[PDB]
Design a protein around this nucleic acid. Structure first.
Lengths: 98, 127, 150, 100, 206
RNA sequence: ACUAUGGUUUUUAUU
RNA sequence: GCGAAGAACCUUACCUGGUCUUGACAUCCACGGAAGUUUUCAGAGAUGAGAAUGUGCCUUCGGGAACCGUGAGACAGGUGCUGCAUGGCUGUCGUCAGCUCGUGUUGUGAAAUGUUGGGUUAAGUCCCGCAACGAGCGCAACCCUUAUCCUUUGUUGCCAGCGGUCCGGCCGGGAACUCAAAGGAGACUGCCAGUGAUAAACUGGAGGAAGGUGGGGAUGACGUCAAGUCAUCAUGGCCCUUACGACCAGGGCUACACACGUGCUACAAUGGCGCAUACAAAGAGAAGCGACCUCGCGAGAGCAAGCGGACCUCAUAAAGUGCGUCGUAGUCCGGAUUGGAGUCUGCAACUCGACUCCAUGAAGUCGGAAUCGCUAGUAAUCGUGGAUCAGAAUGCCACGGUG
C-alpha cells in the first residue's frame, strides 16, 4: 500500500533512475501508468576564484535539483519487497512511505 | 465567430477574446472599469483598443494571471493586438504604425564579475 | 559616438492628449514617484484657469511660448584657447527649453506645497515682471549677437 | 593553520546531538511551576552547565584539511581555499565550469 | 589574464565526476570529508602501484571504491583478500560497510598519468628534460590520439625565468564538449628542483 | 597662455 | 565592510601567570591497558588522586590487531625568518588585432620582406594590389541565451463548451493557454534602387515578432610589475627546541587631547504621521515554519491550528492611491544619549549582544579647498527573502514594485 520518491541533480540520471524504479515496480505488476513528475528546483552560488585575497575575482556555480513522485500502480507486498533491496546506483536519493 | 490572442510580460500572462458586434468588456469575471488600471499605468491595455473602442463595435473578454498589475497590462496589450490584427485587414496597418505588433523582450540586464547590486563596478561617490 | 539617439518616444497624457504634458511630469517627478507628479500637474493650474487668455487648455503652453530661441552660447575649446560659439536650438528643444527652467525654479523654492511652489513661477513665466529674472535668457540673447571671428 | 584544529570538534559535535538541541524542549523534568518564589533546581542545572569546551556555543565546522575556520561554504561542501583545485580535478560531485 | 580550465569545462559530459553520491546541505561537507580522508589514505598506501584514478560510490547503507591501475594483478592479488586491510579502514573512515573494486587502465603509452611516469623515469636518469618529454609524446602519437601536449614547469635548469618548455601535436581541441580530455600534473622532485610535468591527451569526440 | 622635478645599484644564454 | 560574512570563554596569533613537553600533531618498534561509561575529594581550570561499572575485535592457547596511553632511537612543532632559495596561485591594456614559423629573395650580418601600402570590417575579416606564398596562436564559429510559430512533456500545476457534485479542476471532459521543461523552423543582404579604385561592404524602403555579427552570454593570443602570497598550501634553507612549541585562565586585537576610507537614514510637505485600501517575485521550515489566545506596560512565556514541506506556516509586501493633520519653528516630529526595570539565548551578556517599557533628552534646516559617475528597465527610489547562527547587522548574495 506504500508510495515512492526519487530525487537527483543530473538531468539524465533522473530518467535512468526512473527507468530502474518503474521497471522494478512492473516486474510484479502488469497494469501501467508511466512516471509522474514534480517538484523541480534550482539554486546558484558564488565563490572567490583564488585561495588568497583576490576578492574582486569570482566564479559562478549552480545546481538543478530534480524530483519525481513517479507513482506505483500496484504497490503490492511482493513489489515493495523488490524495493527494500533497491540498487540503483549511487548519485540519487529515494523514500518508501505509507 | 470569435478572434483570439496571447501575450506575456514580467512573470504575467494574458488571453484575449473578441466577438464582432457591439457588447460587453470583461476581465477576470468583472468589468474592465471595475478594478483594473487605477494606479500609475492605467490605460496601457486600452492603447490599441482606442483604434476600435468599447461599447461601439465589439464584445471583449480577457483572462490574466501572474506578477504585478503593470506587467499584466503590458501582457494584455500584446494579446489584444494579436486578436485585433486579424479582426480586420486594414486595422493591422494601423497596429504596425503604432508599433503595438512589435514583441518586447527587454526584461533586465544580467550581472558579471566584479559588480554590485545587479550592475555597476564597486562604487565611490568621491574622487 | 555616432550611432545613438536622437529622441526616444514618450506616450502623451491620457487625460489631455498632449506630449508636452507627458514630458513635463517626467522632468517634474522625483525618485520616479510619477503618481505624486500626476497630483501636482493641473493642481498647480488652479490659479491660472480664469487668468489664461488662451483659455485653460493653453494656460501652461503660454509659459513655453514666452521663450522659443534658435541659438544658445556655449564655451568651446579650439586648442590652447577657449571661445564662445553659437550652437543651434532645434525644433525638438525649441518647445522644451522653458519647461526645464520652470521646474528648476520650483525645486529651488521652499514655501507652501509643491503645487504652490510651481504656481509661483508659472504666474510670472509669461509676464517676466520680477527683478533679475531675465538673466535666465542671457544665454540666448548673447547668441543672437555672437560675432566670434566670421 | 595548525594541526591541532583538525580534531577540535569531536566531543563538541557529539553532545550537540545528545543534549544541546533538545534539553530546553524537555526542561519540564528539572523545573517547577507550582511553588511561588522557591528554588530547588538552579544548583543542579548549573551543575549540568559546569563542564566546558563542549557547549551549545563554541561550535565551528572548520576546513578539516587545513584547520582554517574562515571561508567555509556548506553549499560547496569544502572551504574556498581548496575549492578550485578540487573542482577542476573533478573531486566534488557535481561542481563544474559552466559560468553564468 | 584569466584562463578557462580545459578539464573543469567538460565535467559530467562524457568525462564523469570522480565521486557519485547524493547528500543534502546538512551533511554534504561531512560526506565529502570522508571522501577526501579515503583519497589521502589509498593514494599514499598505493604510492608505487601504477594507479591513475579512484572512483567513489555510496550504495544503499554502504560505501564502494573502484581503483584504476595499469597493473591490476598486484592490486587485487590472488584474489580479493589482500584488500581487507584497507577495506576495514575505509569502512571506519566512512562509518558504513565498504567494498573495494578493481579497474584496468587502457593504453599507458596514451594516458596523462602514465606518459608522465614515462617522463619521470627519464628524469630519474637526470637527462635533459626537453628531448625526454618529446620522445614520450612521439611514442604516444605513433600509437593513438588526435592531439597531445606536454609542458614542464618550474626550476627546470632551465633558466632564471618563469617560462616553461613544451611540445604539442594535433588538436587541443577548444569547444568540443564530448572530447573526454585526459589531463594530469606530476611533480618529479629532482636534486635541485620539484619540476612539474603536465600532460593533455585528446583521442576522439564520439 | 602656463605647468617644475624623480640619486646610485637592481634580468633570461640550460647539455 | 579586504583576506579576518557576524573578534563574549570561543575564533586567535599579542601581553601576564599557571599546566607541561620525542611533544596539541606525524611515523617506525617495544610495553601497560579493551574502546568506553559514572562519580568522589583538591584546583577556577589545564591538571592531582581514589571508588565503581564494561571486557568488544581476536586465537596455532603460543598469544595478538584495532584503539588509548608510556617511552627509546630516528624525529617532530612554530600566524618565526626567507616572494632576491622555488613551485602553485595572482594585476591590467582589451576582450585591443596583433604575436610567431618554413621556403625563396634581399644584407657583410642581427635581420628585413612576409604581417607593410590602398579600402571594407567588430576583426591580419574580406576586397584591391602584389617579392612574396602559405601556416600556428588570437579573431569568426562552436558553446550559450532571448523573442515568434509548430511539435513534444503535464501532478500535490492548469481550464474552453458541459453532466455529476468532499460543493473543490473534485470525478467525467481536455493536453491546448498559463506555469515549468525540451526539440525544431524563421533572418539569408533574402529583395529593389543607390554608393563603393563600383569590390569587400555600406545607405534607405518594403515585408516581418525581429535586419543587418538579430539581440545577449561564454570566452584573456604575444607582451605588461619577473606584481601579492612559504598567513590555505606544499617545498629548499635558516633560527628556537629545558622553547619563539600547545593546554588552561585573566587582560587585550572596538586605548586616544587626531587623521584617513566609504555607505545608510534624515535634515521634510513632489514629506512624514494615524486610519483605511490595490497588486508580488524569489527563498526559508519537525529537537521546525508557527496560525491563535492568555498574563502584562511589553519583549516574551505557556499551550497550540495547518503542513511535510505545489490546495500550510514564515505573510495585511512596502512605497504608491486616498482621507484626517501640519510648517519654514532643531518641527506633530526625532528619541541620538543616561539611569531603573525587565524579555531571550547562553558557564557568561559587567565588559563588547538583541528585543521591550514607564521616564528624561541632544544633533540634523546642503554640507572645506575641490571634485565623482553612465546612455534605459539604465540612473533614481521602497519593500521581500536567504546566508553566518546557542544567541544580533545597516555589511555579503539574491527578489519584485515605481521609474
Amino acid at each position: 500500500r506504500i508510495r515512492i520518491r526519487l530525487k537527483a541533480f543530473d538531468h539524465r540520471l533522473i530518467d535512468q533512475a526512473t527507468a530502474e524504479i518503474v521497471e522494478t515496480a512492473k516486474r510484479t505488476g502488469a497494469q501501467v501508468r508511466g512516471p509522474i513528475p514534480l517538484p523541480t528546483r534550482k539554486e546558484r552560488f558564488t565563490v572567490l576564484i583564488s585561495p588568497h585575497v583576490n576578492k574582486d575575482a569570482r566564479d559562478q556555480y549552480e545546481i538543478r535539483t530534480h524530483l519525481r513522485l513517479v507513482d506505483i500502480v500496484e504497490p503490492t507486498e511482493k513489489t515493495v519487497d523488490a524495493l527494500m533491496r533497491l540498487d540503483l546506483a549511487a548519485g540519487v536519493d529515494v523514500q518508501i512511505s505509507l | 465567430n470569435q478572434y483570439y490572442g496571447t501575450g506575456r510580460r514580467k512573470s504575467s500572462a494574458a488571453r484575449v477574446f473578441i466577438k464582432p458586434g457591439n457588447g460587453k468588456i470583461v476581465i477576470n469575471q468583472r468589468s474592465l472599469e471595475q478594478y483594473f488600471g487605477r494606479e500609475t499605468a492605467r490605460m496601457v491595455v486600452r492603447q490599441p483598443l482606442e483604434l476600435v473602442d468599447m461599447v461601439e463595435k465589439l464584445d471583449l473578454y480577457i483572462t490574466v494571471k501572474g506578477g504585478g498589475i503593470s506587467g499584466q497590462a503590458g501582457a494584455i496589450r500584446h494579446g489584444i493586438t494579436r486578436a485585433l490584427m486579424e479582426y480586420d485587414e486594414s486595422l493591422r496597418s494601423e497596429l504596425r504604425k503604432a508599433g503595438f505588433v512589435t514583441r518586447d523582450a527587454r526584461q533586465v540586464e544580467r550581472k558579471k564579475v566584479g559588480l554590485r547590486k545587479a550592475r555597476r563596478r564597486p562604487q565611490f561617490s568621491k574622487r | 559616438r555616432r550611432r545613438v539617439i536622437g529622441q526616444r518616444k514618450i506616450l502623451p497624457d491620457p487625460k489631455f492628449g498632449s506630449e508636452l504634458l507627458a514630458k513635463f511630469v517626467n522632468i517634474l517627478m522625483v525618485d520616479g514617484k510619477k503618481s505624486t507628479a500626476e497630483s501636482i500637474v493641473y493642481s498647480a493650474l488652479e490659479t491660472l484657469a480664469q487668468r489664461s487668455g488662451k483659455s485653460e487648455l493653453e494656460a501652461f503652453e503660454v509659459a513655453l511660448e514666452n521663450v522659443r530661441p534658435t541659438v544658445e552660447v556655449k564655451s568651446r575649446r579650439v586648442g590652447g584657447s577657449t571661445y564662445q560659439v553659437p550652437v543651434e536650438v532645434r525644433p525638438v528643444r525649441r518647445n522644451a527649453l522653458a519647461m526645464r527652467w520652470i521646474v528648476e525654479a520650483a525645486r529651488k523654492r521652499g514655501d507652501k506645497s509643491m503645487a504652490l511652489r510651481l504656481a509661483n513661477e508659472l504666474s510670472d513665466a509669461a509676464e517676466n515682471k520680477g527683478t533679475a529674472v531675465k538673466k535666465r535668457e542671457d544665454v540666448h540673447r548673447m547668441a543672437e549677437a555672437n560675432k566670434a571671428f566670421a | 593553520a595548525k594541526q591541532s584544529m583538525k580534531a577540535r570538534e569531536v566531543k563538541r559535535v557529539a553532545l550537540a546531538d545528545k543534549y544541546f538541541a533538545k534539553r530546553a524542549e524537555l526542561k519540564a523534568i528539572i523545573s517547577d511551576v507550582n511553588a511561588s518564589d522557591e528554588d530547588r533546581w538552579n544548583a543542579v542545572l548549573k551543575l549540568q552547565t559546569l563542564p566546558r569546551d563542549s557547549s551549545p556555543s563554541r561550535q565551528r565546522n572548520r576546513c578539516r584539511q587545513t584547520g582554517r575556520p574562515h571561508g567555509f561554504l556548506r553549499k560547496f561542501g569544502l572551504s574556498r581555499i581548496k575549492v578550485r583545485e578540487a573542482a577542476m580535478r573533478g573531486e566534488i560531485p557535481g561542481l563544474k565550469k559552466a559560468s553564468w | 589574464g584569466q584562463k578557462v580550465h580545459p578539464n573543469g569545462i567538460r565535467l559530467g559530459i562524457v568525462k564523469p565526476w570522480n565521486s557519485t553520491w547524493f547528500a543534502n546541505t546538512k551533511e554534504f561537507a561531512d560526506n565529502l570529508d570522508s571522501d577526501f580522508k579515503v583519497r589521502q589514505y589509498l593514494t599514499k598506501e598505493l604510492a608505487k602501484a601504477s594507479v591513475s584514478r579512484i572512483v567513489i560510490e555510496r550504495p544503499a547503507k554502504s560505501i564502494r571504491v573502484t581503483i584504476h591501475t595499469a597493473r591490476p594483478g598486484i592490486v587485487i592479488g590472488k584474489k580479493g583478500e589482500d584488500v581487507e586491510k584497507l577495506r576495514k579502514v575505509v569502512a571506519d573512515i566512512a562509518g558504513v560497510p565498504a567494498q573495494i573494486n578493481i579497474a584496468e587502465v587502457r593504453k599507458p603509452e596514451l594516458d596523462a598519468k602514465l606518459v608522465a611516469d614515462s617522463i619521470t623515469s627519464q628524469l630519474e636518469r637526470r637527462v635533459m628534460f626537453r628531448r625526454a618529454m618529446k620522445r614520450a609524446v612521439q611514442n604516444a602519437m605513433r600509437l593513438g590520439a588526435k592531439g597531445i601536449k606536454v609542458e614542464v614547469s618550474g626550476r627546470l635548469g632551465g633558466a632564471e625565468i618563469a617560462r616553461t618548455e613544451w611540445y604539442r601535436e594535433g588538436r587541443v581541441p577548444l569547444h568540443t564538449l564530448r572530447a573526454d580530455i585526459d589531463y594530469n600534473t606530476s611533480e618529479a622532485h629532482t636534486t635541485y628542483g620539484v619540476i612539474g610535468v603536465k600532460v593533455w591527451i585528446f583521442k576522439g569526440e564520439i
